[PDB]
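Is NDP placement plausible here? Inputs below.
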Amino acid sequence: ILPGAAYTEKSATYVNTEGRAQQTKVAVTPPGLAREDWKIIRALSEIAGMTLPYDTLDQVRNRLEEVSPNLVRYDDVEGANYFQQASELSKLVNQQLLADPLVPPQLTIKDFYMTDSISRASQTMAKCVKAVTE
Amino acid sequence: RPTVRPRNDVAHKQLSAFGEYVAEILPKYVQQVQVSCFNELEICIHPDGVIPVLTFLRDHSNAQFKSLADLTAVDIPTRQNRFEIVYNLLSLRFNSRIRVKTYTDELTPIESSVPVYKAANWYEREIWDMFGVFFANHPDLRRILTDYGFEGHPFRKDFPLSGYVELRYDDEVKRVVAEPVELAQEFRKFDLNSPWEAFPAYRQPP
Amino acid sequence: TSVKPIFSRDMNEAKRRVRELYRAWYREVPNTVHLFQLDISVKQGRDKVREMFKKNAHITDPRVVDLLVIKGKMELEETIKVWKQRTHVMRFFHETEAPRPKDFLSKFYVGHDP
Amino acid sequence: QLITVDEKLDITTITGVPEEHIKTRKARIFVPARNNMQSGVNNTKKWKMEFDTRERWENPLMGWASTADPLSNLVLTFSTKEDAVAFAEKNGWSYDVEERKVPKPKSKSYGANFSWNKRTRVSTK
Amino acid sequence: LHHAVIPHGKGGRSSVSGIVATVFGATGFLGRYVVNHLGRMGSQVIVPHRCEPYDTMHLRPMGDLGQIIFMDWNGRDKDSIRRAVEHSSVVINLVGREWETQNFDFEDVFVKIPQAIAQVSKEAGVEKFIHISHLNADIKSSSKYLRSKAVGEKEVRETFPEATIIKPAEIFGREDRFLNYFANIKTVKQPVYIVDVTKGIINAIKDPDARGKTFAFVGPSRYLLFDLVQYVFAVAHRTTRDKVERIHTTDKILPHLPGLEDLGVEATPLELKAIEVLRRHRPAKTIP
Amino acid sequence: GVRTSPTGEKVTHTGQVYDDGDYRKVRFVGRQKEVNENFAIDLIAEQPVSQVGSRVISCDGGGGALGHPRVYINLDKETKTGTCGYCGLQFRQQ
Amino acid sequence: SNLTLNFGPQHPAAHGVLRLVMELSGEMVRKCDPHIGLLHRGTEKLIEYKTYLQALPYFDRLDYVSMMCNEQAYSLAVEKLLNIRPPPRAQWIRVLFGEITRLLNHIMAVTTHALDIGAMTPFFWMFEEREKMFEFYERVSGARMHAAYVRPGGVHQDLPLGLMDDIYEFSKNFSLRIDELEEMLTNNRIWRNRTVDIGIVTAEDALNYGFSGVMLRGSGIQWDLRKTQPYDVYDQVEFDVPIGSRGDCYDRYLCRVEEMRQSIRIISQCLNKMPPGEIKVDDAKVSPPKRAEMKTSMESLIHHFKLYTEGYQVPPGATYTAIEAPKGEFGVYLVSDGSSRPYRCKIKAPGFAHLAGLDKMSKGHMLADVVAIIGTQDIVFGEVDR
Amino acid sequence: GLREIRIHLCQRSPGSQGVRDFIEKRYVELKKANPDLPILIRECSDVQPKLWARYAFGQEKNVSLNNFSADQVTRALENVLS
Amino acid sequence: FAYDGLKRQRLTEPMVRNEKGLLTHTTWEDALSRVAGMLQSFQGNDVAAIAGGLVDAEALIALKDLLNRVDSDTLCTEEVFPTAGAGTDLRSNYLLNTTIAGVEEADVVLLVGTNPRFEAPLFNARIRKSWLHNDLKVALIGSPVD
Ligand SMILES: NC(=O)C1=CN([C@@H]2O[C@H](COP(=O)(O)OP(=O)(O)OC[C@H]3O[C@@H](n4cnc5c(N)ncnc54)[C@H](OP(=O)(O)O)[C@@H]3O)[C@@H](O)[C@H]2O)C=CC1
Ligand SMILES: [Zn+2]
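Reply from A.M.:
I modeled the complex. Tokens:
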């Protein structure tokens, strides 16, 4: 187990459902011996003799740019095209539609409150679940 | 009105008239003249005018500001010239006070006013020490308030309140040593400003 | 880009003052070691002078150089006139400071600072 | 008489700041978001510069929050974004600028509360 | 690790090093450097002392508020030993005396007391144990001091098998009884600097490898005793039967034992620090 | 309402007590842990509920200007008492 | 030869510590180079992190022999920027305790000057009087020295019943105490030998070197801010300004002794002319409401809450406000940026310019005279270093 | 061995017109030929177009495509694939 | 309100399995050395990674770069998106291309197999804002949720 940082404890990049890149900021440092997640992997790479070519948050973000330039255009929605090309490729292999009706995982509010590790560990979310079931 | 400070229009008018007087005589240097609502006259000048303007105010027969009350600086980082040099002068003959202001940045020196007022000697050492403003032709410019070897200029807005180093006695080397500052209790920053405007008369244009 | 000079009108004039100040500091070190009864050697003292000068070697603004020389002269005057004490002179050497980690792994083990 | 200097303005060597707190800090230039608990907007007028948050730990004796970061409380105010960026540049601080967020102008109409055929009709007052 | 002893900070006075150390013999020559180094980095230090509180005052400024805790203790009272080590993660034994007294002989200070400390530390669950012996410890020495050092060195290992035993040569420093001893008045000596010994002790605490090992802390160079005494008198610009016997014992060479180099410490030359020690009293060829 | 933990250390009115493996309890060795014995939560629970006639009552903590700011307490609910938010005194409509 | 004076005398002294580096030729002093900053505590920077109320106690600790006078200077500056006016009774109280503070300062100035010159006994007699005046401070504020009593808007609390009677009983006997002091010093030929023609400064030089207070009037300059630029109710009391003729240490000593007598004369009028009424401005957006109101009225509670957390906002502006403090002109250049915390607060300490003139005044004098000249300037390093 | 191809281009700049034309016409054919080769197309405003090829063990090369034609892009990919 | 989860069940120390098969605290040096020894012994398809739902891009690229250096391309996510056709070749294939603010301009919205009220509450509120002020027409295929 390698203790990593939570989203309140690091400056990290997340892309939302529309493709917009945004970054968190450090509010508090990680607890105990926990460490920034990308730094753990960078430290692991060196000990294993496969050192990664970036030593700072800025440098790993320069790397992000090499792989996808939109990932460092913070707060911008770039916009993607070529729907026709994607549509032309989805018509090749013909997959069959199952007979099961479409049921979303969350049908009522009781399913909304706990969905990830943070909210599952939250005592307030546990009180909300208890409230909307009793 | 018991709680409101009374106005004095007579002094406001006198100071305004003298403000124009100074501007008419020193147009080479004077950039702005204003009189505050509590009757204080400020002459804003180009830094080249420090010696001519101060000399005029000291020696002119209608001025006679023989006493330098205070000489200080103010740091406003958002200004291209962040430092504002403020001279507070007093005239015993005319029982009046005037304020003269100029500006400079980190690298532009200001002429020492020691030739006009001997009082300026230490005031300028303090401004150099606390703000890092260099005064040209100062007889003995050096720190006055800070410790020997102190780095930085503590009264700059971007200098941290607790500084960068702190002292303690170390038994191993048998002397007082300087080390990077660590605080058992960090100073607790407070956000006090109300989100509601207080003084409409000073509202800036959008 | 038209500015009031401090002392030197160009880098060549500024570099003359830098060399003059280095000469004064270089000759002062033996006296400083004796006057303050320092446990460091004269070579260590002169190496410290070189290191402090070297760290500013990249400056290209004559006004900034003037200020650095102005401050360096002030520091020398404090040392020669013995306004400084033994502690002030030895503050250049950070003897009680434990070496701080330089490489990525060492920093990673000890904290979150870059 | 004036001289000519074409160098980019840089004062890092004459500010007295330790190198650690110039080269490893990240300044953030922004207009603070309105405190959502209040409607006043007077605190969203000026530009601000803060630095990256660093470690705070519990003092063993009292449990007070200790720090080793000399910039932990440093907040600077600027009239414009350019003033803030200029100040960061000459001080050698690497910086991030975030564009000012301005509330979008809205279309309000008290009459719409009582629409004859639209969903804007309110069911209570 | 208990959450309270996870390291925090930047290694300074207000930081938390995670070290909770009980230092027996802290009021002596070696103890003041060990406590200072522990306090420099924000360790919790328990200082059991036999002396008057007035004689512990020089230790007070060495730690942040609350980081130095003083206790009374008696060498022959095991309950007082237990109270001191009960909450510590390391116990450092610097107890010793260069002479015998009516109430305490060399067997008391170098055998009975170290054994009692080690035993109570093990019974208290203490994880680490640092014990200072002597390079020239031997059960065949003409010196009763060095004979007792050998017997106690054996009992500590038996009682606390994971103990880190350190065997320094004669230590020189401002408060030593070596260079000061000569300035106040065949054999080969390898004196070692006090700060090097202190740094090695601090590193043995932080180094998991040092557990169960025996170290020999010696200086860089070996000096014929005559050359050393002449050098001291030059720099200075100028006792008991046991102490003379110890001073005339040639420093044992033990290449099998790890030294300061294994703990990351660079031995300080005597010539670099000789003036520091002897300045208040106002170069010897080495043996390759 | 003081109580001693299994190690014998008293628990404060805020619930604080060093746990078993906490070195920090070494500070109390040879000294003592200052603990106030008059737990306010227990003392305010001994006060009787005050029976009043009106729907709304006011409390200022007693002593006029030496008490707390005067607040008014609604007593409509019959399932519970009205509790003063400053001093904890309870009221009930009779 | 080069010589450094000791930090302070070997008896209790409360002026602070000074490093005086001197150049001597035989007995004569050729150069004086005071090295200050030994009590520099960055007060002016700390104030920028305080509300206007939170910064007020810092002024007690500047010239910490003239506490309430420093409070008055800061209060007047904030009142000017606030554009409000303290009520008449508060103004009389401020003048009354301003002159009690002048007595406190002049006893310290005159008697420690004598004590350093070797005349120990008057210090003991007159510090019993200081102890009784400390009781007046303590009875109005609860503190003997750093009262924090005078605040923008007025004073913190009204005088307790019976205090003015006790101030009258004290004042009734004080002139006799001054007479005993003058019996020891005024005509003493040893005292005159240590002070007459020592540290002479011309009227012209005193002005250009930035001097103020007794350092000006000792040289014949007819100037006193209480007369020329009156504040509070100083225009309503009668008193004379003592003026020197020789500009030396002896004349300045006579000026300070006579000023003590005039302070008693002013205190007498204050005790008789004290009006009734409230003691802080009746504007709860500046001065907190009474505790009974705060505990009863919704508006009062809000304003109490806001004044003690955010503090009052001050309209943007800058002022230089000065008073005739016991040591000279004490002023503040106070800059407000519109918020509840001052943007800049420069403090003008009269002893700063006076000490800068030590080298000028000591020329052609002997080493022992340097002690006399420092005493005649009445230097406290809390205000010099700030 | 080749492991991944990335093409970066701008949505509007003339310098990426040739890359835009390639994706319009050739990309679908390319994908059919190499079904299990990830060809990551990533548009971002005001970037000079580039072709990244990632080989085994994380070895990567990049080729500029600024002002290229659709055929010059086709040859650039032909070089990379083989 | 879920931020209090950040105060519970936290991983604060590196842990490894001991002789009994139980997790025990250790140092960063020991834990990383153990993982490094395995990463140097395995290659290709013998090394894989799964990324959870709260992982950041900087960690994501770092882990991809590390695994690529043993020639492993089994970098997976828990959330499934079909790889048929273009898959993730074209960003438009897996984005909300209209943008959240773009809902305010639409005149018809078809929701297919989803409960945006709980999947994306702030996106569902944008639909209701358009439903309210623009008279937006909304149709759903899937369970008749509210
Ligand atoms: N200095 C050297 O050259 C060398 C030293 N060592 C070892 O290092 C350790 C300390 O060295 P140093 O510090 O110089 O020795 P010191 O004599 O300077 O300090 C001795 C310490 O032991 C304590 N002590 C002595 N006798 C007793 C006793 N009977 N009961 C309780 N406490 C006692 C003293 O406490 P109090 O102050 O109350 O007497 C003091 O704190 C010793 O074990 C010594 O043998 C090993 C090799 C060389
Ligand atoms: Zn109540």
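Short version: The pocket of NDP (ligand 1) is lined by residues E 25-31, 50-51, 75, 94-97, 104, 109, 132, 134, 168, 170-171, 178 (CB under 6 Å).
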